[PDB]
Design a protein around this ligand. Structure first.
Ligand SMILES: C[n+]1cn([C@@H]2O[C@H](COP(=O)(O)OP(=O)(O)OP(=O)(O)OC[C@H]3O[C@@H](n4cnc5c(N)ncnc54)[C@H](O)[C@@H]3O)[C@@H](O)[C@H]2O)c2nc(N)[nH]c(=O)c21
Ligand SMILES: C[n+]1cn([C@@H]2O[C@H](COP(=O)(O)OP(=O)(O)OP(=O)(O)O)[C@@H](O)[C@H]2O)c2nc(N)[nH]c(=O)c21
Ligand SMILES: N#Cc1cn([C@@H]2O[C@H](CO)[C@@H](O)[C@H]2O)c2ncnc(N)c12
Ligand SMILES: [Zn+2]
Ligand SMILES: [Zn+2]
Lengths: 300, 116
């Protein structure tokens, strides 16, 4: 049963509905899980996310490249990054980023709006925990949000290796229709709710093994409605159980093959390897990143 | 000019004077069946230890000050530090005050048995 899992993924039948968007009304809204002594919510949540990602066909090459957006905290540290680096094979290149300054265990950290972050390299895994605090100021119909979601959608389409995966945080009001549509460009996708935060409408939209083209046409407004319908009708009991057994936590180094291939060479057998977590397609050059810096002189 | 901020001494003095230790060090979930070495690439706490994200336990990282090294390199950032459970209320103080044995990788005084 669900309480011993790291969380709950949106069942397939709910994905197939055609719901209208309703207000989200969780019976345990506001309840908090009991966490192990001295463990932060952010560590528990990311630990559960990674425990769930361990059950998927993630590609895990040598010199894997992971980028983590929204990694800073009001405490000026990066608990999520610490969990990702623990989970990922030693030596994995990990870059993180946030609007606000923070200190991190990542190999490189960029401070600023995500739209100021650039790289010509492709990535094997993208994690985003970005959330705009102004989303709380709900004053109108709950429509698709832009802002950093626009950046993330372009980043996926331009800088995610084929075979790569994503986990992008959403909530009832922090969501984007094009991001759901892009979930249909992966071999598989779901919306995953951690059991430690089961009283929140948060979920991680997970895209598993990127194919670079739609496998499935998804209407994002409908799919978000379907997500809220699932949450509204399936109470999830808060649980920290899975946090206590970390014996199988480390992401196994699969040594997944990395190849560069031209768009003409992506045949159905390649697509099948991509879909199984057995192949990454991208350059394997040195990894270079940068932050745009606006120059101005405020004197006179 | 010999002037240099001494942040280590400042924190040691602040603690001695009764100040609350630096908080929000990032404690990791782990098996607590690891090697118990002091500073590792992945959490290695044993049954007597807690593992923490290294950057969050580094005085220099946390205070946004230069690391006391000509290179300015950090021996904690990007790694995990094992802290005796009895000292886990002040991981920054612990790492600052204690020393790792270059031979066995254990903390001198908190697992190093080389001198026995
Ligand atoms: C799902 N939901 C939303 N609302 C109402 O709609 C507004 C916006 O809803 P939301 O999209 O923010 O969703 P929700 O409340 O579920 O998000 P939650 O606060 O749990 O935040 C989820 C995660 O976002 C991040 N986050 C939230 N606030 C911040 C912040 N200020 N800064 C940084 N991160 C934040 C954190 O990681 C947090 O764990 C809420 O503030 C609330 O008035 C609800 N009201 C009831 N009565 N019952 C509900 O079930 C409900
Ligand atoms: C967890 N998961 C589920 N599926 C698909 O959903 C089917 C049943 O889903 P299920 O494995 O959750 O039971 C599976 O046979 C897959 O086709 C998956 N497909 C891929 N490529 N990778 C995954 O991790 C994955
Ligand atoms: N809107 C917005 C953004 C929010 N965040 C961060 O999400 C983190 C949530 O815990 C928080 O630390 C916040 O600072 C962003 N980071 C970069 N670019 C952005 N455009 C944002
Ligand atoms: Zn440091
Ligand atoms: Zn020794």
């Amino acid at each position: 049963s669900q309480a011993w899992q790291p969380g709950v993924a949106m069942p397939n039948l709910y994905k197939m509905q055609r719901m209208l968007l309703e207000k989200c009304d969780l019976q345990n809204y506001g309840d908090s899980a009991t966490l192990p002594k001295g463990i932060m919510m952010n560590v528990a949540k990311y630990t559960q996310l990674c425990q769930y990602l361990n059950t998927l066909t993630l590609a895990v090459p040598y010199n894997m490249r992971v980028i983590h957006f929204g990694a800073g905290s009001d405490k000026g540290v990066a608990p999520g990054t610490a969990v990702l680096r623990q989970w990922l094979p030693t030596g994995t290149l990990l870059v993180d980023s946030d609007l606000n300054d923070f200190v991190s265990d990542a190999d490189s950290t960029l401070i600023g709006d995500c739209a100021t972050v650039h790289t010509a390299n492709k990535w094997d895994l993208i994690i985003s925990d970005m959330y705009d605090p102004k989303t709380k100021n709900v004053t109108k119909e709950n429509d698709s949000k832009e802002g950093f979601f626009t950046y993330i959608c372009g980043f996926i389409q331009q800088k995610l290796a084929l075979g790569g995966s994503v986990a992008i945080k959403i909530t009832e009001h922090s969501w984007n229709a094009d991001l759901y549509k892009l979930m249909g460009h992966f071999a598989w996708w779901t919306a995953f709710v951690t059991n430690v935060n089961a009283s929140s409408s948060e979920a991680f939209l997970i895209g598993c093994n990127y194919l670079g083209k739609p496998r499935e046409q998804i209407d994002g407004y409908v799919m978000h409605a379907n997500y809220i319908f699932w949450r509204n009708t399936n109470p999830i009991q808060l649980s920290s159980y899975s946090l206590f057994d970390m014996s199988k936590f480390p992401l196994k180094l699969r040594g997944t093959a990395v190849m560069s291939l031209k768009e003409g060479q992506i045949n159905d057998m390649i697509l099948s390897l991509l879909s199984k977590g057995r192949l990454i397609i991208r350059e394997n050059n040195r990894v270079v990143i940068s932050s745009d810096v606006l120059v101005n002189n405020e004197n006179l | 000019c010999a002037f240099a901020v001494d942040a280590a001494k400042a924190y040691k003095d602040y603690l001695a004077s009764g100040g609350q230790p630096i908080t929000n060090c990032v404690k990791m979930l782990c098996t607590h069946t690891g090697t118990g070495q002091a500073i590792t690439v992945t959490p290695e706490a044993n049954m007597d230890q807690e593992s923490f994200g290294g950057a969050s336990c580094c005085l220099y990282c946390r205070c946004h000050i230069d690391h006391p090294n000509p290179k300015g390199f950090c021996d904690l950032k990007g790694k995990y530090v094992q802290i005796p459970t009895t000292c886990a209320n002040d991981p920054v103080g612990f790492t600052l005050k204690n020393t790792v044995c270059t031979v066995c990788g254990m903390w001198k005084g908190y697992g190093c048995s080389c001198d026995q």
